[PDB]
């Protein structure tokens, strides 16, 4: 047995399954779409609540496999309990947690980012860690940070739709208002914006790199891309208040300090808007009414 | 059966806007509310009943008293979920152990006999008070198209399907524990056999008291038992026992 014990603790280990990945967003964000893709499985059984999966890694040059889980959590806060279930103490450092950016519904989108990031802030504070496993963490974490040379990530989905923010709200390059938050947010969070497109399958391998990156150490060798509307993807420490000030030149109408509601506004939808609810007099308040009628006459 | 039903209901609300009825906007959605209530109930049935075919604590018919001579044609609100074996082939390769399929395999499999039961009810259509109008310029997402919301609708809360994730949750997590203790066995060559005999040197009492122990070690796997089931999860770690 000692025997037994002491050479398995000589193994050449697989890369760790354990690790975890945490995605966020508001229902109709694509979330699961996205992660499918990643999957590589062509349909994916839309689940309400938190939705799981798991991605299949494959090394080439080692000939070795392993495998990330990966669970979504469903855009209601009513199923916000479920996150106990998808991250715990020892899986936290192991998980990467993923939010998602709406590009087809831009409005809501810081909104519901604060939404997730909050959620998750109370998760975590719900977790009861040690304030030295959290200064640990938070030293890791940043000297992950500034030791970036040329966690949290932030994925936005249906990107394509600005086509149609150009076509349907008149939008153009300044509504740069909206990249420049979402910039300023990451560095609030210090997170890693990227830009995607299923539907015209942009970065999507930029994407599955990072991921891989990041949770398993692997290399990773693309810049920073801040040029092109709909497929800017800036890593952890490359945004800086200074690199985001570019964008504030290309402003003519409004300033970067402006609401984010004011300049771009929630659009009235037309809903059926219900008619009033008409209900025949009761008999006693007709006929009281009758009354008042015959008692003046 | 409920798309039947769902189908009839619709026509009958179809006549309603083919005669110019008023209001029926405010009608259909409160018989819509209704509806969905009627497949929040039998949703948070189907999940429980799956639940419990997942657990093993489902009741076969053979249970069913018989001594209630009432026939019970009333179907099961939860129906009666079959979660079909689920083997893993555990193996060791050059005294390496490894099993393919793996315990998160395993969680694959659970999950998805899972989520194709979750489908039953949220893939189901919604009933639309405008669907008699074609081509109607109102935007129509998924959880419009379908009841893909029915799993907030559940009466209890969320009780049902979070028990139902729990139990899914569980049954991987022992399979994992115990296709962990397999995957330690790999003790073989993580430190190989010339290591052992570093640690017996040359003395012949201590190589006479090893061959003892490994004799002792080999009868526990001398077990015609292939199989190991933990509720519906089966383990075919007799190609390992191999």
Same mark, same amino acid.
């Given at each position: 047995?000692?025997?037994?014990?002491?050479?398995?603790?000589?193994?050449?280990?697989?890369?760790?399954?354990?690790?975890?990945?945490?995605?966020?967003?508001?229902?109709?964000?694509?979330?699961?779409?996205?992660?499918?893709?990643?999957?590589?499985?062509?349909?994916?059984?839309?689940?309400?609540?938190?939705?799981?999966?798991?991605?299949?890694?494959?090394?080439?040059?080692?000939?070795?496999?392993?495998?990330?889980?990966?669970?979504?959590?469903?855009?209601?806060?009513?199923?916000?309990?479920?996150?106990?279930?998808?991250?715990?103490?020892?899986?936290?450092?192991?998980?990467?947690?993923?939010?998602?950016?709406?590009?087809?519904?831009?409005?809501?989108?810081?909104?519901?980012?604060?939404?997730?990031?909050?959620?998750?802030?109370?998760?975590?504070?719900?977790?009861?860690?040690?304030?030295?496993?959290?200064?640990?963490?938070?030293?890791?974490?940043?000297?992950?940070?500034?030791?970036?040379?040329?966690?949290?990530?932030?994925?936005?989905?249906?990107?394509?739709?600005?086509?149609?923010?150009?076509?349907?709200?008149?939008?153009?390059?300044?509504?740069?208002?909206?990249?420049?938050?979402?910039?300023?947010?990451?560095?609030?969070?210090?997170?890693?914006?990227?830009?995607?497109?299923?539907?015209?399958?942009?970065?999507?391998?930029?994407?599955?790199?990072?991921?891989?990156?990041?949770?398993?150490?692997?290399?990773?060798?693309?810049?920073?891309?801040?040029?092109?509307?709909?497929?800017?993807?800036?890593?952890?420490?490359?945004?800086?208040?200074?690199?985001?000030?570019?964008?504030?030149?290309?402003?003519?109408?409004?300033?970067?300090?402006?609401?984010?509601?004011?300049?771009?506004?929630?659009?009235?939808?037309?809903?059926?808007?219900?008619?009033?609810?008409?209900?025949?007099?009761?008999?006693?308040?007709?006929?009281?009414?009758?009354?008042?009628?015959?008692?003046?006459? | 059966?409920?798309?039947?039903?769902?189908?009839?209901?619709?026509?009958?609300?179809?006549?309603?806007?083919?005669?110019?009825?008023?209001?029926?906007?405010?009608?259909?959605?409160? &018989?819509?509310?209704? $509806? *969905?209530?009627?497949?929040?109930?039998?949703? /948070?049935?189907?999940?429980?009943?799956?639940?419990? %075919? @997942?657990?093993?604590?489902?009741?076969?018919?053979?249970?069913?008293?018989?001594?209630?001579?009432?026939?019970?044609?009333?179907?099961?609100?939860?129906?009666?979920?079959?979660?079909?074996?689920?083997?893993?082939?555990?193996?060791?390769?050059?005294?390496?152990?490894? &099993?393919?399929?793996? $315990? *998160?395999?395993?969680?694959?499999?659970?999950? /998805?006999?899972?989520?194709?039961?979750?489908?039953? %009810? @949220?893939?189901?259509?919604?009933?639309?008070?405008?669907?008699?109008?074609?081509?109607?310029?109102?935007?129509?997402?998924?959880?419009?198209?379908?009841?893909?919301?029915?799993?907030?609708?559940?009466?209890?809360?969320?009780?049902?399907?979070?028990?139902?994730?729990?139990?899914?949750?569980? $049954?991987?997590?022992?399979?994992?524990?115990?296709?962990?203790?397999?995957?330690?066995?790999?003790?073989?060559?993580?430190?190989?056999?010339?290591?052992?005999?570093?640690?017996?040197?040359?003395?012949?009492?201590?190589?006479?008291?090893?061959?003892?122990?490994?004799?002792?070690?080999?009868?526990?796997?001398?077990?015609?038992?292939?199989?190991?089931?933990?509720?519906?999860?089966?383990?075919?770690?007799?190609?390992?026992?191999?």
């Amino acid at each position: 047995s000692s025997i037994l014990s002491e050479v398995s603790t000589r193994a050449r280990s697989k890369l760790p399954s354990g690790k975890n990945i945490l995605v966020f967003g508001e229902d109709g964000s694509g979330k699961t779409t996205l992660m499918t893709k990643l999957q590589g499985a062509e349909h994916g059984k839309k689940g309400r609540g938190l939705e799981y999966l798991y991605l299949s890694i494959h090394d080439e040059d080692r000939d070795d496999h392993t495998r990330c889980n990966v669970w979504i959590l469903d855009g209601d806060l009513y199923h916000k309990g479920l996150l106990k279930f998808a991250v715990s103490a020892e899986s936290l450092p192991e998980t990467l947690v993923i939010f998602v950016a709406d590009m087809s519904r831009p409005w809501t989108v810081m909104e519901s980012l604060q939404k997730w990031a909050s959620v998750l802030r109370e998760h975590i504070d719900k977790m009861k860690i040690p304030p030295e496993e959290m200064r640990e963490l938070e030293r890791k974490f940043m000297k992950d940070f500034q030791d970036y040379i040329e966690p949290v990530l932030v994925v936005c989905t249906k990107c394509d739709a600005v086509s149609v923010l150009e076509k349907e709200h008149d939008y153009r390059d300044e509504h740069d208002f909206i990249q420049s938050h979402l910039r300023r947010f990451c560095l609030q969070y210090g997170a890693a914006l990227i830009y995607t497109s299923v539907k015209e399958e942009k970065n999507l391998d930029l994407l599955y790199k990072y991921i891989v990156h990041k949770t398993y150490g692997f290399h990773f060798t693309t810049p920073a891309l801040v040029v092109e509307k709909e497929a800017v993807f800036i890593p952890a420490g490359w945004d800086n208040e200074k690199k985001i000030a570019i964008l504030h030149e290309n402003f003519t109408t409004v300033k970067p300090e402006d609401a984010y509601e004011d300049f771009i506004v929630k659009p009235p939808v037309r809903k059926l808007v219900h008619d009033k609810e008409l209900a025949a007099e009761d008999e006693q308040v007709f006929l009281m009414k009758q009354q008042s009628l015959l008692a003046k006459q | 059966t409920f798309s039947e039903i769902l189908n009839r209901v619709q026509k009958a609300v179809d006549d309603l806007n083919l005669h110019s009825y008023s209001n029926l906007p405010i009608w259909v959605n409160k &018989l819509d509310m209704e $509806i *969905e209530r009627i497949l929040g109930v039998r949703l /948070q049935a189907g999940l429980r009943a799956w639940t419990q %075919v @997942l657990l093993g604590q489902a009741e076969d018919k053979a249970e069913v008293d018989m001594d209630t001579d009432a026939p019970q044609v009333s179907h099961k609100p939860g129906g009666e979920p079959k979660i079909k074996n689920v083997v893993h082939e555990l193996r060791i390769t050059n005294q390496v152990i490894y &099993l393919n399929p793996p $315990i *998160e395999e395993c969680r694959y499999k659970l999950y /998805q006999e899972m989520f194709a039961w979750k489908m039953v %009810v @949220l893939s189901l259509p919604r009933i639309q008070s405008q669907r008699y109008q074609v081509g109607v310029h109102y935007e129509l997402t998924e959880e419009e198209k379908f009841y893909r919301n029915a799993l907030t609708r559940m009466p209890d809360g969320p009780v049902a399907l979070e028990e139902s994730y729990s139990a899914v949750m569980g $049954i991987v997590t022992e399979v994992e524990q115990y296709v962990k203790v397999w995957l330690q066995y790999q003790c073989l060559w993580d430190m190989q056999a010339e290591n052992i005999y570093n640690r017996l040197g040359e003395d012949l009492n201590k190589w006479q008291a090893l061959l003892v122990q490994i004799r002792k070690a080999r009868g526990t796997f001398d077990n015609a038992e292939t199989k190991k089931e933990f509720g519906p999860v089966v383990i075919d770690y007799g190609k390992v026992q191999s």
